[PDB]
Design an enzyme around this catalytic site. Structure first.
Site, PDB file in Angstrom:
ATOM      1  CG  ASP A 138      -1.859   1.012   1.161  1.00  0.00           C
ATOM      2  OD1 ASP A 138      -2.859   1.527   1.920  1.00  0.00           O
ATOM      3  OD2 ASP A 138      -1.874   1.621  -0.042  1.00  0.00           O
ATOM      4  CB  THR A 139       2.184   4.126  -2.641  1.00  0.00           C
ATOM      5  OG1 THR A 139       0.824   3.480  -3.920  1.00  0.00           O
ATOM      6  CG2 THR A 139       2.296   1.864  -3.572  1.00  0.00           C
ATOM      7  N   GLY A 140      -0.310   4.212  -0.474  1.00  0.00           N
ATOM      8  CA  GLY A 140      -0.834   5.367   0.178  1.00  0.00           C
ATOM      9  C   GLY A 140      -1.072   5.861   2.134  1.00  0.00           C
TER      10      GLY A 140
HETATM   11  C1  LIG Z   1      -4.516   8.896   4.429  1.00  0.00           C
HETATM   12  C2  LIG Z   1      -4.205   8.462   3.070  1.00  0.00           C
HETATM   13  C3  LIG Z   1      -5.190   7.305   2.854  1.00  0.00           C
HETATM   14  C4  LIG Z   1      -6.589   7.123   3.507  1.00  0.00           C
HETATM   15  C5  LIG Z   1      -7.582   7.826   1.728  1.00  0.00           C
HETATM   16  C6  LIG Z   1      -4.316   5.850   3.834  1.00  0.00           C
HETATM   17  N1  LIG Z   1      -4.698   4.404   4.137  1.00  0.00           N
HETATM   18  C7  LIG Z   1      -4.377   3.743   3.686  1.00  0.00           C
HETATM   19  C8  LIG Z   1      -5.574   3.707   2.241  1.00  0.00           C
HETATM   20  O1  LIG Z   1      -4.347   2.889   0.885  1.00  0.00           O
HETATM   21  C9  LIG Z   1      -6.622   2.660   2.622  1.00  0.00           C
HETATM   22  C10 LIG Z   1      -6.325   0.741   2.808  1.00  0.00           C
HETATM   23  C11 LIG Z   1      -7.535   0.520   3.213  1.00  0.00           C
HETATM   24  C12 LIG Z   1      -7.405  -0.259   2.264  1.00  0.00           C
HETATM   25  C13 LIG Z   1      -8.964  -1.456   2.984  1.00  0.00           C
HETATM   26  C14 LIG Z   1      -9.735  -0.600   3.850  1.00  0.00           C
HETATM   27  C15 LIG Z   1      -9.308   0.050   4.707  1.00  0.00           C
HETATM   28  C16 LIG Z   1      -7.679   0.613   4.377  1.00  0.00           C
HETATM   29  N2  LIG Z   1      -7.913   3.277   1.561  1.00  0.00           N
HETATM   30  C17 LIG Z   1      -8.354   3.519   1.571  1.00  0.00           C
HETATM   31  O2  LIG Z   1      -9.311   4.078   1.992  1.00  0.00           O
HETATM   32  O3  LIG Z   1      -8.654   3.255  -0.073  1.00  0.00           O
HETATM   33  C18 LIG Z   1     -10.934   3.815  -0.157  1.00  0.00           C
HETATM   34  C19 LIG Z   1     -10.794   3.933  -1.250  1.00  0.00           C
HETATM   35  O4  LIG Z   1     -11.161   2.745  -1.814  1.00  0.00           O
HETATM   36  C20 LIG Z   1     -11.563   1.325  -0.696  1.00  0.00           C
HETATM   37  O5  LIG Z   1     -11.052   1.014  -1.690  1.00  0.00           O
HETATM   38  C21 LIG Z   1     -10.584  -0.245   0.101  1.00  0.00           C
HETATM   39  C22 LIG Z   1     -10.339   0.732   0.834  1.00  0.00           C
HETATM   40  C23 LIG Z   1     -11.682   2.073   0.301  1.00  0.00           C
HETATM   41  S1  LIG Z   1      -5.197   3.971   5.928  1.00  0.00           S
HETATM   42  O6  LIG Z   1      -5.444   2.350   6.053  1.00  0.00           O
HETATM   43  O7  LIG Z   1      -6.243   5.172   5.969  1.00  0.00           O
HETATM   44  C24 LIG Z   1      -3.691   3.932   6.985  1.00  0.00           C
HETATM   45  C25 LIG Z   1      -2.875   2.860   6.481  1.00  0.00           C
HETATM   46  C26 LIG Z   1      -1.583   3.524   7.202  1.00  0.00           C
HETATM   47  C27 LIG Z   1      -1.247   5.222   7.720  1.00  0.00           C
HETATM   48  O8  LIG Z   1      -0.870   4.802   9.005  1.00  0.00           O
HETATM   49  C28 LIG Z   1      -0.087   6.166   8.862  1.00  0.00           C
HETATM   50  C29 LIG Z   1      -2.712   5.610   7.763  1.00  0.00           C
HETATM   51  C30 LIG Z   1      -3.671   5.316   7.149  1.00  0.00           C
END
Ligand SMILES: CCC(CC)CN(C[C@@H](O)[C@H](Cc1ccccc1)NC(=O)O[C@H]1CO[C@H]2OCC[C@H]21)S(=O)(=O)c1ccc(OC)cc1
EC number: 3.4.23.16
Lengths: 99, 99
Positions: free
Chosen positions: A25-27
């Protein structure tokens, strides 16, 4: 290897006697693992994403094996719905984005 | 380009003649942008992240140029912590993970 993004980039990781599936997860700044009772010292932290914040436990210098590649660093443990390998460990296994 | 992960992979996107900064987010299925106006019909939708569920507006077939690469696809608008480019558009621009 090369991982395309047609589907979720789930890979097998190992943390002690547990193999888990986790997102590359690059995000994610930090690595976040589903609830597990790891040994050692930790500190409380709150991390934010879509929906708001969750409470996690920060463990440092935890060795994790990601697809055969060795990593060691901070892992956050809490009520995440998915195991997340964040940038702190992605760099250690040599992971880049390419297009 | 090849993008390493010691820093957040933030890129400039072009959407409706506006330049915004968005995070290349392989852990996101969907592209989600902070509150903004976009033309055309939208559909109410709900999506879940690490912190729970939010309401978004779903816009289909929206052009976005990401680092000069053209995509046309679904854009969700709502209370995300940061603009994110998810796999639906990462695939269109030919993005892969490599290590
Ligand atoms: C602040 C950027 C981003 C949120 C936008 C960070 N997220 C990582 C994402 O990749 C999550 C990772 C994630 C994946 C799945 C479930 C929960 C989290 N993905 C996510 O929220 O995606 C959403 C949009 O597309 C949909 O598909 C997946 C969920 C929806 S996270 O999971 O909330 C997160 C991870 C690590 C972190 O360390 C400080 C802080 C936050």
């Amino acid at each position: 290897p090369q991982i395309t993004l047609w589907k979720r980039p789930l890979v097998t990781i190992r943390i002690g006697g547990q193999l888990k599936e986790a997102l590359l997860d690059t995000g994610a700044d930090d690595t976040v693992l589903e609830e597990m009772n790891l040994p050692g010292k930790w500190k409380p932290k709150m991390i934010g994403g879509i929906g708001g914040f969750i409470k996690v436990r920060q463990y440092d210098q935890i060795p994790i094996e990601i697809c055969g590649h060795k990593a060691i660093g901070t892992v956050l443990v809490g009520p995440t719905p998915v195991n997340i390998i964040g940038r702190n460990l992605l760099t250690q296994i040599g992971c880049t984005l390419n297009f």
